[PDB]
Amino acid sequence: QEVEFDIPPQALGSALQEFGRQADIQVLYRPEEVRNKRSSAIKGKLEPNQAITELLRGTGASVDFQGNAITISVAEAADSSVDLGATMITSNQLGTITEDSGSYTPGTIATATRLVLTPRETPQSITVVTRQNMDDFGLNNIDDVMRHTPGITVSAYDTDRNNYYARGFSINNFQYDGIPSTARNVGYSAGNTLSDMAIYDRVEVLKGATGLLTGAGSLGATINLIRKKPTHEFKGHVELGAGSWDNYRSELDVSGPLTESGNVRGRAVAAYQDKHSFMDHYERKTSVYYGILEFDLNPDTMLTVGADYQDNDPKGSGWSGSFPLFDSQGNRNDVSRSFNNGAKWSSWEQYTRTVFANLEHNFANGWVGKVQLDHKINGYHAPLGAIMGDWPAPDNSAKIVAQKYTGETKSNSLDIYLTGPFQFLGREHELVVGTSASFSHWEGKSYWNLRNYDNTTDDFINWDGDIGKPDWGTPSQYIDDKTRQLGSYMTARFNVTDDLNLFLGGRVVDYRVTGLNPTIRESGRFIPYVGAVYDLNDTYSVYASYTDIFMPQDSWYRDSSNKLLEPDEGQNYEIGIKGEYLDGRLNTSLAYFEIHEENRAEEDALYNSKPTNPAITYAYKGIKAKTKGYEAEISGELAPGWQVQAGYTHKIIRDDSGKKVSTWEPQDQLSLYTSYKFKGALDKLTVGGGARWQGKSWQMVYNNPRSRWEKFSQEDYWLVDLMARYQITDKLSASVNVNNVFDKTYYTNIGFYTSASYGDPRNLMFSTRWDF
Ligand SMILES: CCCCCCCCOCCOCCOCCOCCOCCO
Ligand SMILES: CCCCCCCCOCCOCCOCCOCCOCCO
Structure with a gap:
C-alpha cells in the first residue's frame, strides 16, 4: 500500500537496491542488463507498483510482480533460448x-x-x-x-x-x-x-x-x-490465545518509521506464555522481548542495532523421560499419559539474549559488503529431581535422583563478507568471499554432593512430585570451556552455458577448544563445496552436489591409546530434479542422497571389558557409517486459494557393524499441511488441515533386573491436525486449532536412559488476532 518514496536519478543498479529498501520489497535484476542505464527520478507518497514503473521510465525494462518480490528484466528483440538461472x-x-x-x-x-x-x-x-x-x-x-x-x-x-x-x-x-x-x-x-x-x-x-x-x-x-x-509503513498486531491445560499466550508486535523522513525505523515484540500441561505438575512460563532499529547513515550504508531476550522457566522438569520403562523386578510399567517423574520444585530453566550490530554498504560496482557483530548469552539454572532407576519396588516406593547445574555461556562473533557479479568468458557469474571469528566461553557450577537427603518416596503409582528438596551442599565442580572458531570461505557461481550453473567453493577452518580438558586443536582444515544445476525445460532442472562437514570430538572421546578421536566428519552426495510452477508460486523437488560419515565415536567394547592402559579407563573407537535415502516435497499454490507443504522421506543409516542405527528415527515419514481460502459468499473463512504419518520405530534397551536386552517398538501411526480462521473484521480475526484429532496415544521417546515420554494428547487452541 501507499509508501513514501525518494529515489534520485542514478545507476539503475543503485536505484533498484535503493527501491527494495524503501519499498520493503525484494528486487532482483541481472547486472549485465542494467549496467549502462540510469533510473528516472521519483518523489513522494506512492503505491509501489506505480512507483517502480515510474522509476523504470526510459530504461526499457519490465517488472515481474511476485508477492514480496519484483524481478526486473530487459527484453531484446533477439533471445536464442533463455538463461533461466x-x-x-x-x-x-x-x-x-x-x-x-x-x-x-x-x-x-x-x-x-x-x-x-x-x-x-x-x-x-x-x-x-x-x-x-x-x-x-x-x-x-x-x-x-x-x-x-x-x-x-x-x-x-x-x-x-x-x-x-x-x-x-x-x-x-x-x-x-x-x-x-x-x-x-x-x-x-x-x-x-x-x-x-x-x-x-x-x-x-x-x-x-x-x-x-x-x-x-x-x-x-x-x-x-x-x-x-522494521518496515517503512506503520503496522502491527496483538494476539491472545487460550489452550488446553491452562495454556495462555499473548503477543505484541510493532513496526515502523520513527522519523518523519524514514531514515530511522524500528520493530518491537514482546510475547508471554504461561501454560500447564497434560503432564501432571508441569507448568512453564516463557517471556520474550525483541527490538531492532535500522539507521540510514546514507542512501547506500545502513546500520542496524538490535537485542532479543527469551526466558524459559518451568516447574516439574524431568531429568530423562517421563517415567521408567521397567519396575524394580523387570516388568514393563503401565502408567497414564499424565505421569511425570519430575519433582514439584525440579526446574531446567534456560535463557538466551543477544546484542547485535550490522553495517551493510552498497558499492556502485553492484557489490555489497556486510559486517555482523554479536554478543550472545546462553544461560541455564537447573535444580533437577526426578524418579530414576528401576522403580517402583514391590511396596510401591521409589528413589529420586537430584543434581543442580547452573551456568552461563558468553559468545562474541565477527562475520564479514563481500558479494558481487563478474564477467569472465563473455558471461555473468557471482562470488562471495567472507571471513569469520567466534570466541565463546562456558562458565558453570555443578552440585551432586547432597548433604543429608532422603531420596526415597513412599508412593509411585500416585506420585505427585511432592517430595522434599535437598541441601545441594558446595559446588562439586567448576566448568571453564572456551571455544574459538575461525573461518574463511569463498564460493563462485559460474553461468557456464544458458542451462548450466556450476558451484565451486570452500571454507578453511581453524578450531581450538580450551580450558579444563586437554586442548583440542584443528588448523587449516579444508571444507569443499562442489555443485551443479542443469536446466531441462521452462519447468524442471537437475542438480548434483558434493558437500562436507566436521566436528572436533568431545574431549572424553579418546581411544585405546589415550588419544583423541579424529574429528567426526561426513560427506553428503546428492543428485535430484526440482520443478518450478506458476512463476515461482509452487515448488517441487525429488532427491536421492547418501551421507558417508567417518570417525563416528563408538564405545569400543573389546577394550572396555577389562581396560589395560592405566592411562584410560574407558576408550572409544572411531568408525564409518552411511546414510542411503531419498526425499520428495511440494510447497506453494495448488490452485488459487489453496496452499500446501508436504514431504516424503525414506532413510536407513548403517555403521561399520552393518547394523541399523538411529532406529528411533522412522525409516519412512510423510507430512502434508494445507489450508484453503474460500471465495464469494465466504471469502473471509480460511479452512485447513494436516497429517503426519510415520512408520515403525524402535530401540534396544537393557532390562537390568532380568539381565537381557529387549526391543521396544512404536507401530506406525498418524497424527491429524485441523484449523479454521474467520476474518470477521478488516482489523480482527478468530481461530481454532485442534491438534491430534483422533487423540492417538504414542511415544516420542523410548529408551533414553531407560525411560519413556508420550506425545501430546488432543489439544485445542483458540486465538484472536487484532491488526492495527
Ligand atoms: C545496546 C542495546 C541496543 C538496543 C536496541 C533496541 C531498540 C529498541 O527499539 C524499540 C522501538 O521500536 C519502534 C517501534 O516502532 C513503532 C513506531 O511507531 C511510532 C509511532 O507512530 C506515530 C505516527 O505514525
Ligand atoms: C480432549 C479434548 C476433546 C475436545 C475435542 C473438541 C473438538 C470440537 O471442537 C470444536 C470447537 O468449536 C468451538 C467454536 O467456538 C468458537 C471460537 O471462536 C473464537 C472466538 O473469538 C473471540 C472473539 O473476540
Whole structure:
C-alpha cells in the first residue's frame, strides 16, 4: 500500500537496491542488463507498483510482480533460448520476506552459499517453514516448527529438551540471520530447542552436510532462523490465545518509521506464555522481548542495532523421560499419559539474549559488503529431581535422583563478507568471499554432593512430585570451556552455458577448544563445496552436489591409546530434479542422497571389558557409517486459494557393524499441511488441515533386573491436525486449532536412559488476532 518514496536519478543498479529498501520489497535484476542505464527520478507518497514503473521510465525494462518480490528484466528483440538461472543481484541479503506472502513456499534463500538464490537454483535440499504456515497452524516455537517440517523427526530427551533428526543425525547446528552459534553440547546451547516464533519471519532448514557456512558442526542439517525486521509503513498486531491445560499466550508486535523522513525505523515484540500441561505438575512460563532499529547513515550504508531476550522457566522438569520403562523386578510399567517423574520444585530453566550490530554498504560496482557483530548469552539454572532407576519396588516406593547445574555461556562473533557479479568468458557469474571469528566461553557450577537427603518416596503409582528438596551442599565442580572458531570461505557461481550453473567453493577452518580438558586443536582444515544445476525445460532442472562437514570430538572421546578421536566428519552426495510452477508460486523437488560419515565415536567394547592402559579407563573407537535415502516435497499454490507443504522421506543409516542405527528415527515419514481460502459468499473463512504419518520405530534397551536386552517398538501411526480462521473484521480475526484429532496415544521417546515420554494428547487452541 501507499509508501513514501525518494529515489534520485542514478545507476539503475543503485536505484533498484535503493527501491527494495524503501519499498520493503525484494528486487532482483541481472547486472549485465542494467549496467549502462540510469533510473528516472521519483518523489513522494506512492503505491509501489506505480512507483517502480515510474522509476523504470526510459530504461526499457519490465517488472515481474511476485508477492514480496519484483524481478526486473530487459527484453531484446533477439533471445536464442533463455538463461533461466542467470546471475541475479538482489536487494535483501537474507532472501525474500515471507510475512504477508500468503504462501507456504519460500521466495529466495541464502542458506546455501551466502548467494541469494531460489530453491530451484540451489543444489541442496532446502525446506522452509514460512510465516503464514506458522500463523495458520499456531506453531509458536521451534519445537512446533520442527514437528511441522517435512523430513524432521522430533524426539524427547525430557520435558525441556527435544532432539531433531534428519537423514540419520541429530541436528546441532543453529544459526540466527545466517550467523552460527556454538552448540558443542548442552552447556553452550541452553534454550536452542525452545526459541519462541514471535520474533522470526521463517525458519529455513538446509539438509545434508552444511560445512560451507556453519563451519564445525553436525551432519543432518542446519536450522537457520531469520529475525523480523522494521518496515517503512506503520503496522502491527496483538494476539491472545487460550489452550488446553491452562495454556495462555499473548503477543505484541510493532513496526515502523520513527522519523518523519524514514531514515530511522524500528520493530518491537514482546510475547508471554504461561501454560500447564497434560503432564501432571508441569507448568512453564516463557517471556520474550525483541527490538531492532535500522539507521540510514546514507542512501547506500545502513546500520542496524538490535537485542532479543527469551526466558524459559518451568516447574516439574524431568531429568530423562517421563517415567521408567521397567519396575524394580523387570516388568514393563503401565502408567497414564499424565505421569511425570519430575519433582514439584525440579526446574531446567534456560535463557538466551543477544546484542547485535550490522553495517551493510552498497558499492556502485553492484557489490555489497556486510559486517555482523554479536554478543550472545546462553544461560541455564537447573535444580533437577526426578524418579530414576528401576522403580517402583514391590511396596510401591521409589528413589529420586537430584543434581543442580547452573551456568552461563558468553559468545562474541565477527562475520564479514563481500558479494558481487563478474564477467569472465563473455558471461555473468557471482562470488562471495567472507571471513569469520567466534570466541565463546562456558562458565558453570555443578552440585551432586547432597548433604543429608532422603531420596526415597513412599508412593509411585500416585506420585505427585511432592517430595522434599535437598541441601545441594558446595559446588562439586567448576566448568571453564572456551571455544574459538575461525573461518574463511569463498564460493563462485559460474553461468557456464544458458542451462548450466556450476558451484565451486570452500571454507578453511581453524578450531581450538580450551580450558579444563586437554586442548583440542584443528588448523587449516579444508571444507569443499562442489555443485551443479542443469536446466531441462521452462519447468524442471537437475542438480548434483558434493558437500562436507566436521566436528572436533568431545574431549572424553579418546581411544585405546589415550588419544583423541579424529574429528567426526561426513560427506553428503546428492543428485535430484526440482520443478518450478506458476512463476515461482509452487515448488517441487525429488532427491536421492547418501551421507558417508567417518570417525563416528563408538564405545569400543573389546577394550572396555577389562581396560589395560592405566592411562584410560574407558576408550572409544572411531568408525564409518552411511546414510542411503531419498526425499520428495511440494510447497506453494495448488490452485488459487489453496496452499500446501508436504514431504516424503525414506532413510536407513548403517555403521561399520552393518547394523541399523538411529532406529528411533522412522525409516519412512510423510507430512502434508494445507489450508484453503474460500471465495464469494465466504471469502473471509480460511479452512485447513494436516497429517503426519510415520512408520515403525524402535530401540534396544537393557532390562537390568532380568539381565537381557529387549526391543521396544512404536507401530506406525498418524497424527491429524485441523484449523479454521474467520476474518470477521478488516482489523480482527478468530481461530481454532485442534491438534491430534483422533487423540492417538504414542511415544516420542523410548529408551533414553531407560525411560519413556508420550506425545501430546488432543489439544485445542483458540486465538484472536487484532491488526492495527
Ligand atoms: C545496546 C542495546 C541496543 C538496543 C536496541 C533496541 C531498540 C529498541 O527499539 C524499540 C522501538 O521500536 C519502534 C517501534 O516502532 C513503532 C513506531 O511507531 C511510532 C509511532 O507512530 C506515530 C505516527 O505514525
Ligand atoms: C480432549 C479434548 C476433546 C475436545 C475435542 C473438541 C473438538 C470440537 O471442537 C470444536 C470447537 O468449536 C468451538 C467454536 O467456538 C468458537 C471460537 O471462536 C473464537 C472466538 O473469538 C473471540 C472473539 O473476540
